């Protein structure tokens, strides 16, 4: 057999038997009768569709808001370059007298921290920032965690 | 020939022989249900078909503005008015014999003199 | 039909080797006894809402089985008239009482005279012999193979009677 | 509404407080499966209407053989007030009216 | 030739409710066994349904068609021996009047 | 309207006259295989043989055109259900994108969106295509057996005439459509390269 089939269970019940079937016919002796004909018959004769609107302005005022056109477009739509360029920002570089501390404080927290979190926690220049990570930590490449700065074992293991 | 058809899942029964009594049994092959045969016919070719010579009438044949007229009488309601048609069998090996079909009875025979 | 009935939605897929009711509630009997990153960038096709509501709705097709399994039923949905229709009650007071049709379904018999398997029947389709023989299901019956859920319920629940 | 299969390990016990097996309690109701033209269905199947309120009444020989619907007046004299039911089938099998709803989820 | 006209094509779907109004049962319930003698219904080359009393639809159809409420272009053909009933909305069949 | 692309079914009367057996079989889409037309009809749900042969034959006593049909049954006998049809049908697809699991479900979709389109494309319609390939089958056989003549391929109702209208529609509808894959294309560029 098989263990597992995935089933829904619901609350279902029978609620009664079909017994005849019935087919309902308007009566042709009604007063009311011939206008369900008419009803009927308009069905076909609807035209639910309309035609294209033809533009009744000057050629000329309809083509300017095409090619080059001295209008400049104000929609939003789709600008994501200005979404996060908008985000732009410069920092010193806190000195080594300081951030130095601000390392080890951070390896501590983590043993395995990357380059774009490092740029953003420490808020420094890279170039710098290059310095006290490859003096301190070394970056795996090859391993599973490939692209990730620890800090050293000489100071790890203590 | 007869297709006889099962009663419990609807299958074809194909013909069986039992050795106990020599008799012929149409037999399902998935459910195993069984019936007797009527009649020993077990397989029916055909090579010269008469079928289909009058496929096609229906009750308002006669409606048909296509199909020709014509004034022979029936020769089962004494009635001039019917309408004729050739052999409905493509096969380039049938004869033009005629078939009339009646208005006033619906009823169908031919103008053959040599078989009928 | 052999009471209780359940119907409910459930995958019909290998509807041939599934637990019956009535074995499961014996095994539960038993149980006790015995305890005791993407591509950042991706396409969608419009699809009208009502067609994809039946879809997922309609994915898994009713399925009417009784405890004893005996009858199996599998339900399909049909189009043609499921909301042309307008169902009628009679109360038992001879009054009528008005009530709209849904859907319609349509049910069919499963596992009545044990069908093969998938790799059984490729195999006959392939040219293992001229044509398949005649009463090979009769054959293949006496061996014990390809039987059916009613007669696999009823010789395990034989198995327990007897101790 | 995702649950288990087989569920050898009893687990509706807990999971729904209602019974999973088909009531036929209601079973034994005859019911009438009548086919509408589009007027008089527009109206009928309509869920903003259709609040108990008394649609006409149905009308059958004493022998028989022939069934006509009376619409009251309140169609506004816009469709006919009588109707003829004509019995497609006299004799019906294996048709059946089968309901479905939720199941309680806690305890 | 002269007077030869190339239809434009229509909406087919009026034509399908029309018929389902005037008898034309859905082909989810026929069954071939129980009535032998009716009229196959086609729409554009669609089996769409069977009708009992082909005679009456076809004379209605014809009668809507000549009135103008059905556009001229639809092709209407009954074949009697065949017991088929054939109705063309699609565009590109060639006619002439007459 | 739609789609405006074409898929062709072939049903095929395989074997000559001299032929001991001769069996139809059905060409579908996407599947490079010719299937029994027993097998799918027991794929859209008709499982028994007597509804099968009722759904071809409107004749009970039409024992001519069951005769020819018996083949048929017999080649697919062994698929007796809608899962074994539908996985033998699916396993002929050109797909191989699935293992297993969904290979009954495709198949279901090839028989839903890829045969005979021209009747509707809508889950819940398999009595209608079940009822048209019936038809073709009838047609088939029927000439089979030499009770109609080949449709001729010059009468002119059956040919269709494309004006201008026609023509320019169906050039429109591929310029469109490679109009809208042109825009598509800037905005997946434009959110990936960080543009405006
Ligand atoms: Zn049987
Ligand atoms: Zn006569």
Known sequence: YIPYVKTIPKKTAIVGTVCHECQVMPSMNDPNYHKIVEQRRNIVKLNNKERITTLDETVGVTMSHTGMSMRSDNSNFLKVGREKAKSNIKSIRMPKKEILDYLFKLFDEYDYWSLKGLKERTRQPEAHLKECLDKVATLVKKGPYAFKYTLRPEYKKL | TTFRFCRDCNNMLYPREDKENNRLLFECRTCSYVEEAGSPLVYRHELITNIGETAGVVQDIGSDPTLPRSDRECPKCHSRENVFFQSQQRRKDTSMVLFFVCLSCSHIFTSDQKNK | ?163 | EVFDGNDIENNETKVYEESLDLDLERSNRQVWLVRLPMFLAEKWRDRNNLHGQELGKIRINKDGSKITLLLNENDNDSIPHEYDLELTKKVVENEYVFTEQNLKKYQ | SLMSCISVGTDPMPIITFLSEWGMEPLEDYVPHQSPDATRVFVNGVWHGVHRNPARLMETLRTLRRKGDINPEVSMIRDIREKELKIFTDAGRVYRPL | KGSRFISTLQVKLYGREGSSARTIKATLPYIKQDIPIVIIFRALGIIPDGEILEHICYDVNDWQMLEMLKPCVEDGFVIQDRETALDFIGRRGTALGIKKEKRIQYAKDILQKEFLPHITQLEGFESRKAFFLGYMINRLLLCALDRKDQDDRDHFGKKRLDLAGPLLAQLFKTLFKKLTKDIFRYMQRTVEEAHD
């Not at chain 3, 509807?15 to 499961?24: D, K, M, S, W």
């Not at chain 3, 405890?67 to 909301?83: I, K, L, R």
């Open chain 3, 1 to 163: 039909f052999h009471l209780p009935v359940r119907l409910h939605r459930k995958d019909t897929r290998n509807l041939q080797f599934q637990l019956t009711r009535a074995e499961i509630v014996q095994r539960q009997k038993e149980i006790s006894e015995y305890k005791k990153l993407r591509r950042k960038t991706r396409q969608l096709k419009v699809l009208d809402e009502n067609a994809k509501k039946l879809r997922f709705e309609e994915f898994y097709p009713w399925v009417m089985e009784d405890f004893d399994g005996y009858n199996t039923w599998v339900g399909s949905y049909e189009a043609g008239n499921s909301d042309s229709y307008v169902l009628l009650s009679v109360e038992d007071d001879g009054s009528f009482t008005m009530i709209p049709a849904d859907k319609v379904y349509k049910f069919t018999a499963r596992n009545k005279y044990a069908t093969l398997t998938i790799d059984e029947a490729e195999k006959r389709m392939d040219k293992k012999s001229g044509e398949v023989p005649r009463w090979l299901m009769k054959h293949l019956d006496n061996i014990g193979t390809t039987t059916t859920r009613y007669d696999r319920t009823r010789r395990k629940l034989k198995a327990v009677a007897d101790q």
